[PDB]
Design a protein around this ligand. Structure first.
Ligand code: PLM
Length: 133
């Protein structure tokens, strides 16, 4: 189901509109500044049917592990506690995070060998491109 082409180590090379996304999330200024400077490495691995996404940066490291279609609790890098679910749709790995009464999505898709993460919260859309390394 999940392309084994997602598996590996990915390095952020381009980020667009991420400041606005973080602002939408209520991330404060000092954290936004560091957040915008970060160029995370994302490591995607699979163990059976459990996918792990590890995000590594000087500022913050996060790690989520899940099975597709199974709701899980996540503590995000900005310390939201969300109820999250990851599914595949059309080859894209779609992550929905819900908390209080909000929702944000992170879609990860492979585009010509690169991984493109689109982060969306209502009208705010970020695009983050990663290179496989
Ligand atoms: C991601 C490391 C930087 C940390 C910035 C801290 C607050 C950011 C809010 C969390 C959003 C994470 C969005 C991830 C999208 C992606 O994988 O590229």
């Amino acid at each position: 189901g999940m392309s084994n082409k997602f598996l590996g180590t990915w390095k952020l090379v381009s980020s667009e509109n991420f400041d606005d996304y973080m602002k939408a999330l209520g991330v404060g200024l000092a954290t936004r500044k560091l957040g915008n400077l970060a160029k995370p490495t994302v490591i995607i691995s699979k163990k059976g049917d459990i996918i792990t996404i590890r995000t590594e940066s000087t500022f913050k490291n996060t790690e989520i592990s899940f099975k597709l279609g199974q709701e899980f609790e996540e503590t995000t890098a900005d310390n939201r506690k969300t109820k999250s679910i990851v599914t595949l749709q059309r080859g894209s790995l779609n992550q929905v995070q819900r908390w209080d009464g909000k929702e944000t999505t992170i879609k990860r898709k492979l585009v010509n060998g690169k991984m493109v993460a689109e982060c969306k919260m209502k009208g705010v859309v970020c695009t983050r491109i990663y290179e496989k390394v």
